[PDB]
Design a protein around this nucleic acid. Sequence first.
RNA 1: GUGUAGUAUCUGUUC
RNA 2: GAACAGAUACUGACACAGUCCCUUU
Lengths: 131, 71, 105, 814, 397
Amino acid sequence: SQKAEVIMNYHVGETVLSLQKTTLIPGGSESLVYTTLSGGIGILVPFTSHEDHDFFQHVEMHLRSEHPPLCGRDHLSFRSYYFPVKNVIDGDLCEQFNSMEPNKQKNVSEELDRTPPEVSKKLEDIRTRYA
Amino acid sequence: QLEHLQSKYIGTGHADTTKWEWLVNQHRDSYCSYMGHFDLLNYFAIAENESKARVRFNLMEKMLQPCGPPA
Amino acid sequence: AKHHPDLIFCRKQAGVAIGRLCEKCDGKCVICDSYVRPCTLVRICDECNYGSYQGRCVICGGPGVSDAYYCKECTIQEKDRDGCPKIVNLGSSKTDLFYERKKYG
Amino acid sequence: EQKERKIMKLLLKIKNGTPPMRKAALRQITDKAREFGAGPLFNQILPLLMSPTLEDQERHLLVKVIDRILYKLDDLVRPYVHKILVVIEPLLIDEDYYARVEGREIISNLAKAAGLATMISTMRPDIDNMDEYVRNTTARAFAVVASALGIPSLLPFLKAVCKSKKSWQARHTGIKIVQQIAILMGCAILPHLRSLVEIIEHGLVDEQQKVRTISALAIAALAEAATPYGIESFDSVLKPLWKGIRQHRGKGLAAFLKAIGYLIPLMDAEYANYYTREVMLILIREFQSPDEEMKKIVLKVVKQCCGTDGVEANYIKTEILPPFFKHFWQHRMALDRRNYRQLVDTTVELANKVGAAEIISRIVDDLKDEAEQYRKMVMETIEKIMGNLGAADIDHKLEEQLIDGILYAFQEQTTEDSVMLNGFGTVVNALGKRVKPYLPQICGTVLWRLNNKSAKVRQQAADLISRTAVVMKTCQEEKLMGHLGVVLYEYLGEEYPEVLGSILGALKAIVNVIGMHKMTPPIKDLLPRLTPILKNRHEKVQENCIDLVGRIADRGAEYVSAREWMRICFELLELLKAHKKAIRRATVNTFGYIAKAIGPHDVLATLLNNLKVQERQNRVCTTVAIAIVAETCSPFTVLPALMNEYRVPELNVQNGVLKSLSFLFEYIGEMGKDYIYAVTPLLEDALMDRDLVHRQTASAVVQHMSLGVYGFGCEDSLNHLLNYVWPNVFETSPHVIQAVMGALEGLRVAIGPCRMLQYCLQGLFHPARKVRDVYWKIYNSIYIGSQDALIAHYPRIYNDDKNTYIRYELDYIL
Amino acid sequence: MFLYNLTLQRATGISFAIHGNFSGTKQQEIVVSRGKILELLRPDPNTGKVHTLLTVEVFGVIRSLMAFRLTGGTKDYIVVGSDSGRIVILEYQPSKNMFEKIHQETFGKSGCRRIVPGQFLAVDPKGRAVMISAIEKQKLVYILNRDAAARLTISSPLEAHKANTLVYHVVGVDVGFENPMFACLEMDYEEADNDPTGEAAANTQQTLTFYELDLGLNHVVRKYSEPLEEHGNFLITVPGGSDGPSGVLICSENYITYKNFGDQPDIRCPIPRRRNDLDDPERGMIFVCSATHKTKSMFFFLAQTEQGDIFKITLETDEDMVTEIRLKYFDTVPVAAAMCVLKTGFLFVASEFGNHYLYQIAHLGDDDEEPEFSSAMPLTFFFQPRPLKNLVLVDEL
RNA sequence: GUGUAGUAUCUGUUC
RNA sequence: GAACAGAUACUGACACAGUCCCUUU
Ligand SMILES: [Zn+2]
Ligand SMILES: [Zn+2]
Ligand SMILES: [Zn+2]
C-alpha cells in the first residue's frame, strides 16, 4: 500500500510521555519542547543557514574523537542505540566546549580556523535565540 | 570449521532448536533488559502502586521458569 | 589471517600485555589485515606472553619491532572486543616451505 | 586384500608424482576415511614409517595424513596405542623443533581421543625400563599425555609412583615426568603446585645423589614456572636445599645453587638479602671453578640474585665488582660460545643494576686487546649497555677514551658482521651532539676505507652514512654533507648489486635528512643517472631505488619534465612484477604521488591498458594503484573514466573495475555518500547471477560502501541493494558465502537489525534442512552482535492453552 | 530539515548515593548518580543549604557506583560500572574540578547484556580487591595493588565463570588482613529445564556460597555451600576483625538471619509489624535499604521497610558467638531506594519519587521509652508508630 | 619464475 | 542426479632463500 517513511531518528535514553510544539518565550520561534519521566526537559531547534549546520557538524565530528566520554562509551553507538541517528546534532557535546582544557581548545580552534571566543559566541547564539 | 564463535555464547541457536527454548531465552533476555534499564523500570513502578524493590523481586523470582512448564 | 582457514586464535580473556609486530607486519591490521586508520591497541592474554614468547609477532612469531593496532572498521564492527588474536597453529605453509628448502638445500 | 592394495596405491600416489595427484589422494582419503579401518592401515603404515630410509617429505606426508585421519576415527585407535607410541616417540626425541612439536600435538590428540585407563593399561610395562634413552623419551610422552585431558586426573598416579620404595628407577621416571610437565606447561600449573610439591619434598633427603640432584632441578623448574608468586607453597623446601648447599660439592652443588638462585626472587626483600649474604661465601668459592658449565650456572645465579630489588646497591658495588672483574674476564672460557653469551648477558644485567659509569670505565680499558673475539665481545657489551641505560652518566675523560677505543677498533676490521655497524650507530645516537669534534676524523676514516680495497666494505660505509645522517644533521653541518653526496654521486656506477643497493640507501638517507633544493648535486642530473638503475634484478637495489624515487617524486615534483615522468611510469609498468610485497607497496604509493603531481589522464589510461596480462598477481596491484590514484586525485574526476570501461565483454576488466571501485570506496571513507548514485546501475548489473566472481566483488563493494557511509542516515539508498544481496545466500562456494556474510555484517551496523530479522523470520522454521541451517547461521550472526537492540523489534506470537508466549508488561497504559 | 538538540532542565531522579572523603579532607561529600548524569554535592553544617559542586554527563547508563580507599591512603576512589563492556576508576581533583580517568580495562561487549558484567560491584571494605559480577555465568575479580610511585595499578582479571547460574546480590565480607572473601546468593537452574512434569519452581531453593581469593596461587574456587530455606533478596555487610564479628545478614520475607562461617548456627528473628495494618494480612514484608554508622565506640545498622519505617538493629554478640539480635523502632520516612548516614548526625534520604530531604539527628534514641524487640522472646510483634521526634527537618531538595 | 588452499568449466567407463 | 578415472580455466593486497627463539645427569 501507500507505506510511510521516516525522516528523523534519535535516542535520548529516557522515556518520553509528552510532546508539544509551541513557543516558550514571547516573540520567539516554534520549537519542539518535550518532557521525560526522568524529569529532564529538552527542546529541538531547526537550523537556519547551511554554514552554521556544517560548522556545527564539523565541531561535533572533531569532538567525538577528540573528547571521548568519561565512562568509555561510544557516543555515536549510544545515540544509534536502536536506530541510526538521522539529521540530528547533539548539543551537549558542543556545549562541553567551555569546560575543556585550554591547550585542546587552542588546538581545535586552530584546526577550525576560528577563535575560541568566536566559537563560544556562535554556540551561545542558538541558546540566546531559543530560550 | 570456523564456528567456535557461535559455540562459546549463551542462548545461541542451532539446527534443531525448537520454539520453547527460543521463547524462554527471549523472555530471559527481555527480563534482563528490563532490570538493566532505569526509566523502563520507573515506568513499571509508576504504572502499578508498588516500589522498586518489589518489582525487582518479582522479576528475580520470575526468571526461573517463565513461559510455563517445559514439554 | 583470513586467507588461512587452518589458523585458530587463542580466544581467551585479555590481560595487560601488549602485542608486538615485526618489520614485514608493520602496518597490517591483526584481524582483517588492512592498512588504513589504526585507532586502538591490541591486548594479549597472559599465557601467550611468557618466557620465549615475550616480544614476538602475533602472526608469524618473529622479533618484535612494531606495535599492534586495530583499524577503524574493526572498532565500528566491535570485533576487537574478543579474545587475544595470537595464532596458536604452527602453519602448514611455513613447515612445507622449510622442508622444501631443506630438501633442495 | 583389496583394502591393503588400495592403501598401497594411495601411498604410491601420495609419495610419487605431481602435487595435484597428492592433493587429490588426500581429498579422497579424507572423504572416504570412514571405511578404511585401522588394523590393516596401521599395520601397513608403521613398518614403512619405522624404516631408517625415511626422508623429511615422506615423514611429513605420513604424519600429516595421520593427523588428518585422527579425528575421522574417534574411538578406533585404542588397541594399537602402544604400537603407535613406540614409533612416534623416536620422531619427537630428535632435536628438531618442528618434528618434536608436531609429535607433541600428535600425542596430545591421541591421548584426547583415548582415556586415562587406556593410557594406563598401555604404558605401565615400560615404567621400570633400564635404558636411559627410552626412559627419557617415555617421560616426555608421559608429560604430553598428562598435559592432555588435564593434570588432576594424572596427579594421583604421579603421587603413587613417587611414593614407592621398590627401586630408584621408578622414582627417577616420575620426577623426570614432573620436570617435563613443569618445563612445558609454564604458568598453567600454578593452581596445582602442591600436587607436585608434596611429591618432590620426600626426594630431597635420599642418600642417592642422582635422585636429590634431579629433585633440586625439578624444584628449580617449578620455581621458574611460578616466577611471580609461590613462596607460601615453597617455604618448606628451603632447609634440605641449604643442607645440600653446605654438604654437597660438585654437580649436585651446581644444581642446588641453580635451584636456590631460581627460588630467591620469589619472596620479599629482607629474606632475599639475608639469603644472598649467606650464599656470598659459596659464590666467591665457586667463582674460580674450572668447569665451563659451572661458570654458566654461577653466572645465571649471580644475574638472578642481582635481578631483585632487595639488595642494597652500595653493598653489591663494594662486594661483587672486584672479584667478578678479576675472575670473569679471560679468553679460555671466551673460546666457547655459550660461555661468553651468558657472560655478556650477566655483564649487561649488572651494568643495568649498579650503574653504567663505573662498569664502562672498567671495561673500556680492554678495547686495546689484539684478539678479535674479545674486541667484538666487549663492543657488544658496550653497545648493549648504551642501548639499555643511556649516555647521561659519562664525563669528559670517559668520552674521549670511548671515542679513541671505538676509532682504534674500527681501524682494523676483518670479520663480515653488521654488529660493528649496529654498535657504532647506537653509540653515536646515544652521544647526540657530543660527537661534534670527532666528525671530521671519523668521516675521513670512513672515506679512506671507502675508496680502497676492491670496494668490499662500501656497503658498511653506506650503512654508516645512513645511520649517522640524523646526528650529522643535528650537528649543524652542510659542507661535509655535500661532499658525501657528491662522492656517492660519482661512486654510483658500481656494478655490484649489494653495493649499489647500499649506496642507494645512503643517498636516500641523505636526501631524507638534507633539503632537496639545497642538495649539492642537482636533481635534474640525478634522475637521468637514477633511471637505468631500476632495471636490476636484485631485491635490495630495487627496493632502495623505488623508495628513493617515491621520495623524490613526493618532495621534488617541481624540476622534472613530463618525458622522464613517462619514462619512469613505463619502467614501473614492468617493474610491478617484483615478488617482494614492500616493493609493490612502494610502487603503488609512488604511482599515487606521481598521479597527484601530474594530471590524472595519461597515467590513468596507462594503468587501464595494463589489465590484460592474464596474471592474477599484478592485476590486483594495478587495481590498488588505480584506487590510490583516484583517492589522491578528485574522486569525481575518475568515475567517468572508469564507468565507461565496464562494457568490455572480457571478464577480467569487469573484475578489475569492480575491485577498483571497492578499494576506492574503502579508502574514501565518509566522503563516499555523494558517489552512491553513479554506482547503483553497476551494482544492479553485477548482482545478477552471471558469475561467482562478479557477485563476490559486488558484495565486497556493498560491504565497504555501507561501512563507509555508516552514521550518515543513507538507509534509503542502501535498502534497495539488500533485495538483490539476499538471494546470494544459497551457494556451496566458501568464498562467496564468506563475502555475503561479510556484506550482511557490514550492512547490519548501517541499516538496523530489523530488516534482517524480518527477512530471517520467514525462513527460520522452514520444513527443509539446508535452508534452516543457513537461516539459523544468519540469525546467530546477527544475534551475537548488538543483541541489546532486539527486544523492541521482536514480534508477538500467540500462545497455546498450555504455555504463555505474551509479554503483558509492555502493554501497560498510563 | 535538520534539527538541533538542546537541553533546558537536568534530570533530578536519584538512583545511587555513596558517601566518603572524595577530596581527601575530613569533610564528607556525597556522590549521586542520575540516569545518565554524574553529580557531586556536599552539605554545610553551618548553614544546611546543600550546594552542587560538580555535574558532568557520562553519555551512558550507569548500573553501579562504589567507592573505596587504599590501605594507608586518605583519598576515596570512585569505581563506576556502566552498561559498557569496560570498568573505569575515577578520581576527583579539587583544583581542576573535573574527574580524571585513571585505569580502564575491557572485558566484553557493550550494552545491557545478560552475561556481560557491570550489574553488581563488590568491593572489599579494606580496599585490596574489587569484584564485578554479571547476571548469569560470568564473574570477574581484580586486584588493585599499589606501586612504589604512590599510585595504583590493576592486574589481569581472574576466571570464576560458573556454568548456567543466576546471581541475586554480591557483597564483600571483612576477613581481617587474610585472603578476602566474597558472598553471593548462588542459585542453580539446570534441573528446572530437565523436569517435564511441571515440578521445577517448587522445592527449588537458593544457596549462599563463599568465594575465596588466594593471593598466593592467584585463583578463585568455590569453598562453601550453605542452602537456605527462604528466598532472600540482598545481603548486609557487617564490620569484622577488631570491631564486631565478621558476618552477613540475610534479609527475607518477615525474617532476618545472621550467618557466619565456622561454629556459628543460623539465628532467625521475626519482623515487627504495625498496630492494625490496613493491608492484606497474607501480604509479605521485605526490606529496601540499610545503613552502616561504623562509629569507633559502637556500630548500629539502620533499615527501612515497604511502608517506610526505620528500625535500628543492634548486634548483641559475644567475643566469638552471638546471643540474640535486638531490634528497635526509630522513625518513619517516605519510601526510599538508597540512603546513607553521615557524620555529625547528618542523615540523607533519597526518596524514590518526589522531593529529597536531609534530616539531622538531634536525639540519639538511646534506650527509648518504647519497648524493643529481640530474638529471645518466643512467638508476632506489634508496635504503635509515633510522629517524628528523633529527627527534625532542616532542609529539603 | 616456484608453492598453499578453494571454486568453476570441458572428457574414458558405469547406473 | 550417485560414482571409479582425465583435461582446461578462475578466486583468497595468499606465500618464496629462513641459521636461528636455544636447552643435561
Ligand atoms: Zn592467548
Ligand atoms: Zn610478522
Ligand atoms: Zn581491521
